[PDB]
């Protein structure tokens, strides 16, 4: 490392988490993420991607990998229903003893916002990504990574190994676990430790 090359590479991890983000929060035809999705399943991206070639290589095959499933079809299993989710992206799911939408887990992440000056519950893993990206982008460091320690990664690595496990599309599985290597990048970077909460699923 020296300075120049840290400074040239400072968006790495924004960029990153943007487009996790996107990809866990808005369906694969949305014009926010379509371009991204038709790239994944047909173009070389991979070397632009921080992780190393040998770890990202069964990745970036996995997103072109076939299933007589559609991404639409995949989208509304995996995240809208109508039947129960295999893992559902949201922090309280995993951080409640009651498992529910808007609950105790959301209320905590919504006064550490409020606290620190930040402005559909807002702890979607998808909706976290993207306000992680906001603030590095914004030179909030600090923030960020109280953010990522102690509202996302305590329930992040779950929430991902249930997806991957189930998710039974090529294309989410490759998404978790490129976001499962990403984040775990994260976490072993970060100055302070991730909060040990208990999960309930």
Not at 44 to 71: I, R
Not at 93 to 103: I, K, P, T
Not at 111 to 131: A, K, T, V, Y
């Amino acid at each position: 490392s020296d300075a120049m090359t840290t400074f040239l590479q400072r968006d790495e991890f924004a960029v990153t988490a943007r487009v996790l983000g996107a990809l866990f929060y808005y369906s694969p035809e949305s014009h926010e993420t379509a371009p991204l999705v038709q790239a994944l399943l047909n173009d070389d991206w991979q070397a632009q991607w921080p992780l190393d070639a040998e770890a990202l290589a069964p990745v970036a095959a996995m997103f072109k990998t076939h299933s007589e499933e559609s991404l639409p079809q995949a989208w509304q299993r995996l995240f809208i229903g109508p039947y129960a989710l295999p893992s559902p992206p949201w922090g309280s799911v995993w951080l409640d003893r009651e498992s529910v939408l808007f609950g105790d887990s959301t209320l905590a992440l919504r006064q550490w916002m409020r606290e620190n000056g930040i402005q559909e519950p807002e702890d979607h893993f998808g909706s976290l990504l993207l306000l992680a990206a906001w603030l590095a982008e914004n030179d909030r460091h600090h923030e960020c990574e109280q953010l990522l320690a102690w509202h996302l990664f305590p329930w992040s690595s779950r929430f991902l190994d249930v997806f991957i496990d189930h998710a039974g599309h090529p294309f989410y599985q490759a998404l978790g676990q490129l976001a499962r290597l990403t984040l775990a990048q994260w976490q072993a970077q970060l100055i302070i430790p991730v909060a040990v909460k208990p999960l309930f699923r």
